[PDB]
Design a protein around this nucleic acid. Structure first.
Ligand SMILES: [Mg+2]
Ligand SMILES: [Zn+2]
Lengths: 149, 50, 1341, 253, 51
DNA sequence: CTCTGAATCTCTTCCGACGCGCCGCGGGACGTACTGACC
RNA sequence: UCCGCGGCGCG
DNA sequence: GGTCAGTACGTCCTATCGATCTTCGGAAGAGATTCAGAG
């Protein structure tokens, strides 16, 4: 069981088990934050605007890549599906499904992992010339279903 | 007992330093006290004109 | 016997007291502290090892996993000190810590391990200390000042009755832990004892006693003594201790064993007590009225009924006495209270106590600590246990425990770091004792109660804070991690430790930008002691008592060198011989006096230790086997000096200069000048600017060598030998055979610092003071630094001074300077400025460094190269472009008609605005260095590539030259070894050096030495290769510039600044002045020989200022010059070495009972000639601080030089040739240039920028701001009738926008008329008042 | 705007942001028919936020920014030594002002002071521009500025013309009494140090051990005449405190 | 921002006599309140006065 | 023996000289998705 | 360009 | 309907009060409590 507590940072949720110190947080328009996963560093992905390396993070916004010196570099970008497939092993048990998503659209363009806030779920969408190609694949019941947006 | 043409001992110089530093610190505080008094006097008397 | 280096120029000493203890290394207080911080400690008592053992091992919450610490290691820094200074990074070493993660089996026992892993976790960077006690934090060089803070322990103090009417002395006790909450006890005017924690709401003291599980009966038993009563038939008896009757009025008859003797109304006299004791009166009979009114000690319960007849602390009364008698209480116990010796304070406090149980007391303290919330038994118990009784949150340090036990007279000096119940009880008992009249309050300013906390301690504290944060994170991750699929590196985040350490070294109040005017500034900054800082005092709240000189400062803290202003007394200077005890207390050395003989044995005593003994003054005379010549010797003992017999003396001072600091010690004739002027002179020595050419002080104190050497400004030879190569930048020494290690090249290379910028924009330059082939010993000065001359501190210049008024140009401390001083560049100084041009990314385009600056003539562009950066060596003046930079103007859209108009006007139709770096107005200098820093990913310009290629060539050349020198040394070793055995000298010369290395040898250990040196040669080659590759990659690599910065171009300007009127000059005796006129040479006063004076000083300053030491120096300096003159002429006449030797020997022997004893008969003729050439300008003289030259000795030295004894000569006015009517004191004084230069002070403004909100002129010269016309100036104008001037200063010249525009236009038009309006600051005030909900308006507008 | 794309913000902006956040949250809770406890807590927080905005620190602990220093409220803007009244209204920074280290002019008459030529040029720039355009040497103001920047000889002649009988005010801090500001006719001197008449030093309490003095230029005719008639050193030979002479011989004199 | 603490249509234009959207940018449009963004064309000094 | 007023005690708030110079450090900003209005 | 803090110095 | 601009929400990141810097002196005013006099 996990209960609500208040402290210097407002209101949070902490688990009653003395052996477990897991803590979630209250957000603006929800009962409680989703179960944010542990950050996973990737030394093989280099930053472009700086010399840092990218680290995968999770949150209500979604799953993203951020510089390891985040207060200084402050460089973030969304991961590609091929990038995830390159480092599939390091991904925690939950996120592995993202690696199974199709990596390229029928037009052969490269895909990117996005977060649909209206449905609170991760999908993969393809972009060409920086604009969305209008093709997206979602995860519905253990399979990936793809179609025009 | 000694003057300044003669040399003060180490002990005599150490004794004199008490008065020296006391005077310096007293000036440091006295400036602030006098300034506050002067500002109060100016504020009370600034209206008066012949 | 004097060394070869010392024989160059021997300063004649005038001291008479033999030196027993050499002056300690002046920077030990910093180096020792940091060494304790970083160096390994197998016992785990100091530094990083102690912190690691304090935090580790780390375990999970009831888990089967543990993280433990094995060892730590400081790695090699990535950059050296110079590289860090150039690149603007911290000189730090990485901290590698070996850690072991152990996971046990789930089955019992808990100790059954099942897997162990070990790895070297990296946990941040530790800023290392340089060889001279400094830190490089962001390229900037910083000093961590030591802190004089209240020692942990317990202190008893009084308010001296100031807080209450009639001056009732209220007593308080305070427990100061090293880390934790404070605990104070204090007496109220009603004699009630109260307690407070962290100076929070006052509470009754007994509450704490009740919180420690002590009942009221137990409290009374602890604090009071009991009196026993018995009731038998109709008789009441008391058990009496006769001493208890002392001071009590005999209000009733006293009978015992059928004997009665009492005088009613009288006090019980001592004779009465003695009679009672001898009669063995153990019991007395007393009336009911006497026992009525006493306080019940323990609760009494009627056994028949179980009803509490009388509780503890209740006052006895006749009815209560009858009740207890009828109940059957044969024996009664009360508590004894005497109004003089045994007060009722605890009982009265219990009466005022609003609690009645342990839980009630815990609830009360919980509500006091955490107000506004309901209490809880578990929460209250946890809070009380954590406040003082948990090692995690309370730490009364080892020094704290020592002081705590000493104050309570406990035998043990070691113990637990948390408070026990007995500790609190004993503190309360001691406070009650002080209230009663036994014991005295502590002296807070006593140096035995203050403690020195240095760099290592503070760094350890911050590291411990970071490490406890890391420990909390580690516990969390260990409890909530995948135990087997990770490594120790995955559990430790280095961010908190690095953050804490970096914050301490950058933002702390004690981490200070090092003052670097001269070497004395560096030494005095590193020896500084501050009462401020974290855990210390504050300027506005520290009283006079803290600032004042205390008797315990003798030999520990200088009484003179404290600064003026708000910091007076709060910033002190460590004395010359003072060091720090193990516990952090200042110690001073003394010579042990054993059976009337002073011994060379030296004991370092602290203030508490010093108070016990009788210590003789350093000037007390003793001869042959040490014995006080005088039967009576002056001593100070317990802060009260007087005369004592020889036998009573326990210790003697080690030196006559052990009371002063370094700066005060450098002042000659300090005992002849007032402490105020001595303070001013010591402070002003630190502001002296190095000059173009260093000049030794003719009149010194003998401390110049120590200051110059201990400060790392000089290149000091670390091994003796013969100098093999010299130039302006490099000294190469061939080490002696008996001084080099086996398998070594035997060559030392010293690289000199040439024209680098100081923290104060002054010049740091090292110059060789040795020549080819000259012998060098260990410790010899090889190169002089700023303000150093042959290894002696040279802050200023020796100047010919006449003390006379001269036509008002010396009117008020003003100084008249000859033009010969300016022509000889004696006070000319070099200033280096760093100017930076920063290219930044901006909206609508990045800024570009280019020479194509719009709307700028080709003449201004000619000084630049093709990349837009000024050439090295270019002479530049104010307004010239150093680095050309442009910035996009924005869109600035123009209509086609507007575009045509701009095209017709000229080149104004451009989208680019000038943002180039220009020389500040008034600055004229030369470009001596250009450094280009480029963010990685930005293409390097042509100038950047050229600089990179030059740096690569320089690196290759330097490494190759060092390798060649080391190889030459190694092959010299080869030749020496082969000569020592198996010599083939002719064949060896025929053979090349590689064949020499390939040659064999006889079967001796020399073959082993050859093998070792060949291996060292291979190591030299490999080291050269790896260093070349590393330096190449470091030069090529990009720079970690600030975000948004594309490239930074830094230009260094060297300006030689000549002495001009307005510049501030001072001597060493508090004699400040500002130059008023540079007088032509023919106008200066001159003597019979025609020599003009260089500086004319006003005689009037000396009498009022009482700095007579400057007069004596002026005399002695004259003598110092006179001897030199007699040498100089003797050198010009090319006289024989014999006459020169005789005269110089006479000069050295002139003193009376001097301890120097120079003997020129042991010097070679060439050495004597070298000495005489060095003595040609003057004979340097050492006059120690309180053992200096007497007046008669100065007269004798003047007589040797054929100079007048009075020190006054007949001067003639150069303007008229007429003799001045009286003889004038003309001599030589050492004068300084005090960095308060007029060209840094002059500023003028007509119109410039204005503040955004106040719409008033900016402030400061750097901002080109206007002067502040404050309220006192407004009062001055109001005292006059200056209404229009005041209006124009308030309205037009400051804040009225339309007014100032119209005034400018009218002045241009020739109309000096004002059109004043409303100041904008008043509109701001109206809006701010309206923003507060107050309707403020102007009426009848 | 700052270097690096950051924006320097006033503390008032933070206070207003807190107030607006609390107000909007309270309005949203009121719309959604929130329970009494939640709306009461939100109202209390809004009251605390408004109190902090008006006068921070008067009740409870003052709300602090990221620097752990209390935020500056409107009362702090009005109150104190650094407030508007004492820092901006009763005293001001002024144009046409300068400062420099003072030295002795023993050749000076009582009514004149030595003024550095560079300081005079900078201070009298607008007068020089006007006299340049009067004589036709500079057609426009830009030409006048270029001429003065180049420091031509005719500019020096113009500067000598403009300072002939134009008094300047010399002030030494602290201005304890009205003699702390006095008017002098400036004589242009080479060098960067102001030359002060020896007899006025006692009134200024000025010595020459490093003192700096401030120079102000009266602009208007009334200001010049007040300097000449009321504030000039020749009118200040008696002390207003006691009537005894204040311009009294000392030291070498 | 549209209704923030520095709003142009509440307190005034950022630059003199220029609308926020740039539709009107000269003194000839003085006093005109833009239909697109509601910012009056006037001097920036009003941002110093308007509460 | 009790009640009221005056006096005394406790707690909280306000004030503390002016002018000038130098150095160091810090200070919310950026990204992505969804909704509305206009064409 | 603004504000704040810390440290140091001069009058 | 489709596209662009504007607006909304999330991330950095928390979770014990524990970080945190922490502790003057003097004078005046307001409120609370106690003593003396009168009933
Ligand atoms: Mg002075
Ligand atoms: Zn618009």
């Amino acid at each position: 069981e996990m209960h609500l507590k208040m402290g210097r940072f407002g209101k949070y949720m902490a688990c009653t088990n003395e052996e477990c110190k897991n803590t979630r947080k209250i957000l603006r328009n929800g009962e409680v934050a989703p179960p944010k996963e542990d950050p996973v560093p990737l030394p093989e992905l280099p930053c472009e605007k700086s010399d840092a390396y990218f680290v995968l993070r999770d949150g209500a916004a979604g799953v993203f890549l951020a510089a390891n010196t985040f207060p200084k570099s402050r460089e973030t970008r969304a991961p590609l599906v091929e990038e995830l497939y390159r480092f599939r092993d390091r991904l925690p048990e939950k996120l592995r499904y993202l690696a199974d998503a199709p990596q390229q659209d029928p037009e052969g363009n490269k895909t990117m992992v996005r977060f649909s806030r209206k449905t609170k779920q991760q999908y993969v969408s393809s972009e060409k010339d920086g604009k969305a190609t209008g093709w997206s694949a979602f995860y519905v019941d253990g399979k990936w279903v793809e179609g025009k947006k | 007992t000694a003057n300044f043409r003669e040399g003060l001992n180490v002990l005599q110089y150490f004794i004199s330093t008490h008065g020296a530093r006391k005077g310096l610190a007293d000036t440091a505080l006295k400036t602030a006290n006098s300034g506050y008094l002067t500002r109060r006097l100016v504020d009370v008397a600034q209206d008066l004109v012949v | 016997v004097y060394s070869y280096t010392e024989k160059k120029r021997i300063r004649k000493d005038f001291g008479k007291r033999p030196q027993v203890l050499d002056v300690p290394y002046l920077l030990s207080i910093q180096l020792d502290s940091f060494q304790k911080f970083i160096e390994q400690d197998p016992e785990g008592q100091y530094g990083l090892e102690a912190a690691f053992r304090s935090v580790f091992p780390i375990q999970s919450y009831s888990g089967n996993s543990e993280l433990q610490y094995v060892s730590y290691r400081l790695g090699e820094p990535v950059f050296d000190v110079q590289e860090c200074q150039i690149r603007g990074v911290t000189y730090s070493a990485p901290l590698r810590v070996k850690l072991r993660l152990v996971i046990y089996e789930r089955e019992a026992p808990e100790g059954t391990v099942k897997d162990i892993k070990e790895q070297e976790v990296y946990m941040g960077e530790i800023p290392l200390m340089t060889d001279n006690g400094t830190f490089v934090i962001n390229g900037t060089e910083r000093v961590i000042v030591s802190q004089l803070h209240r020692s942990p322990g317990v202190f008893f103090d009084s308010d001296k009755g100031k807080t209450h009417s009639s001056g009732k002395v209220l007593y308080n006790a305070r427990i100061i832990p090293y880390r934790g909450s404070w605990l104070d006890f204090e007496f109220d005017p009603k004699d009630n004892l109260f307690v407070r924690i962290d100076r929070r709401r006052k509470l009754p003291a007994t509450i704490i006693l009740r919180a420690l599980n002590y009942t009221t009966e137990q409290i009374l038993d602890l604090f009071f003594e009991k009196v026993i009563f018995e009731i038998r038939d109709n008789k009441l008896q008391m058990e009496l201790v006769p001493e208890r009757l002392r001071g009590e009025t005999a209000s009733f008859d006293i009978e015992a064993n059928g004997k009665v003797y009492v005088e009613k109304g009288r006090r019980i006299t001592a004779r009465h007590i003695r009679q009672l004791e001898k009669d063995d009166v153990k019991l007395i009979e007393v009336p009911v009225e006497y026992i009525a009114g006493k306080v019940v000690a323990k609760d009494y319960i009627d056994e028949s009924t179980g009803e509490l007849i009388c509780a503890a602390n209740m006052e006895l009364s006749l009815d209560l006495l009858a009740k207890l008698s009828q109940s059957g209480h044969k024996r009664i116990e009360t508590l004894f209270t005497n109004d003089l010796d045994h007060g009722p304070y605890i009982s009265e406090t219990l009466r005022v106590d609003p609690t009645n149980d342990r839980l009630s007391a815990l609830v009360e303290i919980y509500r006091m600590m955490r107000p506004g919330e309901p209490p809880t038994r578990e929460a209250a118990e946890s809070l009380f246990e954590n406040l003082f009784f948990s090692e995690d949150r309370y730490d009364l340090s080892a020094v704290g425990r020592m002081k705590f036990n000493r104050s309570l007279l406990r035998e043990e000096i070691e113990g637990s770091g948390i408070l026990s119940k007995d500790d609190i009880i004993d503190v309360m008992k001691k406070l009650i004792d002080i209230r009663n009249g036994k014991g005295e309050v502590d002296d807070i300013d006593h140096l035995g109660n203050r403690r020195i906390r240095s760099v290592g301690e503070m760094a350890e504290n911050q590291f411990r804070v970071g490490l406890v944060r890391v420990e909390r994170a580690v516990k969390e991750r260990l409890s909530l991690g995948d135990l087997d699929t990770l490594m120790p590196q995955d559990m430790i985040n280095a961010k908190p430790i690095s953050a804490a350490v970096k914050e301490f070294f950058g933002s702390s109040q004690l981490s200070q930008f090092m003052d670097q005017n001269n070497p004395l500034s560096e030494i005095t900054h590193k020896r500084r002691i501050s009462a401020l800082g974290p855990g210390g005092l504050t300027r506005e709240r520290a009283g006079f008592e803290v600032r004042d000189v205390h008797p315990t400062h003798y030999g520990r803290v200088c009484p003179i060198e404290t600064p003026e202003g708000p910091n007076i007394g709060l910033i002190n200077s460590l004395s010359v011989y003072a060091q720090t005890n193990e516990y952090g207390f200042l110690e001073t050395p003394y010579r042990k006096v054993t059976d009337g003989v002073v011994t060379d044995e030296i004991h370092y005593l602290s203030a508490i230790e010093e108070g016990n003994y009788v210590i003789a003054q350093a000037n007390s005379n003793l001869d042959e086997e040490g014995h006080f010549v005088e039967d009576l010797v002056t001593c100070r003992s317990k802060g009260e000096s007087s005369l004592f017999s020889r036998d009573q003396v326990d210790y003697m001072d080690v030196s006559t200069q052990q009371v002063v600091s370094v700066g005060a010690s450098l002042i000659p004739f300090l005992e002849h000048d007032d402490a105020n002027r001595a303070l001013m002179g010591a402070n002003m020595q630190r502001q002296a600017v190095p000059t173009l050419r260093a000049d030794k002080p003719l009149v010194g104190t003998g401390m110049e060598r120590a200051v110059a050497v201990d400060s790392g400004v000089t290149a000091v030879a670390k091994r003796g030998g013969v100098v093999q190569y010299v130039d302006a930048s490099r000294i190469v020494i061939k080490v002696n055979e008996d001084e080099m290690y086996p398998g070594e090249a035997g060559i030392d290379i010293y690289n000199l610092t040439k024209y680098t910028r100081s923290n104060q924009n002054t010049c740091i330059n090292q110059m060789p003071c040795v020549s080819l082939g000259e012998p060098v010993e260990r410790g010899d000065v090889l190169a002089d630094g700023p303000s150093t001359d042959l290894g002696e501190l040279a802050l200023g210049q020796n100047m010919r001074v006449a003390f006379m008024p001269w036509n008002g140009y010396n009117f008020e401390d003003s100084i008249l300077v000859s033009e010969r001083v300016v022509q000889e560049d004696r006070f000319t100084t070099i200033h280096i400025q760093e100017l930076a041009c920063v290219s930044r990314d901006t909206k609508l385009g990045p800024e570009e460094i280019t020479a194509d600056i719009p709307n700028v003539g080709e003449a201004a562009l000619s000084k630049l190269d093709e990349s837009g950066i000024v050439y090295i060596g270019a002479e530049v003046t104010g307004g010239d472009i150093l680095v050309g930079k442009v910035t996009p103007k924005g869109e600035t859209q123009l209509t086609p008609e507007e575009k045509l108009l701009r095209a017709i006007f000229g080149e104004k139709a451009s989208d680019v605005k000038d943002s180039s770096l220009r020389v500040p107005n008034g600055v004229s200098g030369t470009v001596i260095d250009v450094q280009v820093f480029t963010r990685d990913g930005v293409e390097k310009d042509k100038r950047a590539l050229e600089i990179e290629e030059m740096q690569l060539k320089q690196a290759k050349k330097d490494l190759s030259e060092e390798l060649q020198i080391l190889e030459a040394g190694l092959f010299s070793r080869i030749r020496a070894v082969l000569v020592a055995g198996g010599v083939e000298a002719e064949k060896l010369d025929k053979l090349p050096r590689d064949r020499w290395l390939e040659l064999g040898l006889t079967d001796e250990e020399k073959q082993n030495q050859l093998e070792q040196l060949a291996e060292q040669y291979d190591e030299l080659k490999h080291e050269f290769e790896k260093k070349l590759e590393a330096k190449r990659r470091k030069i090529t690599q990009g720079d970690d510039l600030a975000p948004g910065v594309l490239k930074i171009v830094k230009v260094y300007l060297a300006v030689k600044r000549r002495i001009q009127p307005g510049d501030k000059m001072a001597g060493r005796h508090g004699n400040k002045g500002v130059i008023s006129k540079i007088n032509p040479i023919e106008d200066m006063p001159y003597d019979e020989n025609g020599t003009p004076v260089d500086i004319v000083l006003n005689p009037l300053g000396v009498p009022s200022r009482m700095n007579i030491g400057q007069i004596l120096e002026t005399h002695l300096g004259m003598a110092a010059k006179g001897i030199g003159d007699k040498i100089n002429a003797m050198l010009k006449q090319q006289q024989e070495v014999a006459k020169l030797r005789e005269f110089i020997q006479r000069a050295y022997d002139l003193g009376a009972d001097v301890r120097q004893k120079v003997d020129l008969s042991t010097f070679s003729d060439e050495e004597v000639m070298r000495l005489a050439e060095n003595l040609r300008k003057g004979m340097p003289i050492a006059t120690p601080v309180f053992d200096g030259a007497k007046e008669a000795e100065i007269k004798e030295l003047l007589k040797l030089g054929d100079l007048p004894t009075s020190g006054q000569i007949r001067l003639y006015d150069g303007r008229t040739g007429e003799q001045f009517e009286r003889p004038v004191t003309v001599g030589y004084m050492y004068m300084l240039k005090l960095n308060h230069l007029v060209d840094d002070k002059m500023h003028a403004r007509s119109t410039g920028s204005y503040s955004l909100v106040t719409q008033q002129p900016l402030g400061g010269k750097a901002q080109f701001g206007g002067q502040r016309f404050g309220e006192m100036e407004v009062w001055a104008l109001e005292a006059y009738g200056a209404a229009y001037t005041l209006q124009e200063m308030l309205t037009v010249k400051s804040d009225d926008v339309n007014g100032r525009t119209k005034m400018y236009k009218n002045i241009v038009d020739g109309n000096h008329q004002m059109e004043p309006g409303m100041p904008e600051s008043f509109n701001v005030l109206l809006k701010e008042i309206r923003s507060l909900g107050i309707n403020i308006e102007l009426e009848d507008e | 705007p700052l270097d690096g794309g950051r924006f320097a913000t006033s503390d008032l902006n933070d206070l207003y942001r807190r107030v607006i956040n609390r107000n909007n949250r309270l309005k949203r809770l009121l719309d959604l028919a929130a329970p009494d406890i939640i709306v009461r807590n939100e109202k209390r927080m809004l009251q605390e936020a408004v109190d902090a905005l008006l006068d921070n620190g008067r009740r409870g602990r003052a709300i602090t920014g990221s620097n752990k220093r209390p935020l500056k409220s409107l009362a702090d803007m009005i109150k104190g030594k650094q407030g508007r009244f004492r820092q901006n209204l009763l005293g001001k920074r002024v144009d046409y002002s300068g400062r420099s280290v003072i030295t002795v002019g023993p050749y000076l008459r009582l009514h004149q002071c030595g003024l550095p030529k560079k300081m005079a040029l900078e201070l009298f720039k607008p007068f020089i521009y006007g006299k340049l355009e009067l004589r036709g040497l500079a057609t426009t103001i830009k030409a006048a500025k270029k001429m003065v920047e180049r420091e031509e000889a005719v500019v020096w002649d113009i500067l000598d013309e403009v300072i002939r009988e134009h008094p300047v005010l010399l002030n030494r801090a602290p201005t304890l009494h009205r003699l702390g500001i006095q008017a002098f006719e400036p004589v242009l001197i080479e060098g960067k140090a102001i030359q002060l008449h020896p007899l006025v030093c006692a009134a200024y309490n000025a010595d020459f051990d490093g003192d700096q003095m401030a120079v102000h230029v009266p602009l208007t005719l009334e200001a010049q005449l007040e300097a000449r008639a009321l504030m000039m050193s020749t009118n200040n030979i008696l002390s207003p405190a006691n009537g005894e002479p204040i311009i009294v011989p000392s030291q070498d004199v | 921002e549209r209704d923030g603490l520095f709003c142009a249509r509440i307190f005034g234009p950022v630059k003199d006599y220029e609308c926020l959207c740039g539709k009107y940018k000269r003194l000839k449009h003085r006093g005109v309140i833009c239909e697109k963004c509601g910012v009056e064309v006037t001097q920036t000094k009003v941002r110093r006065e308007r509460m």
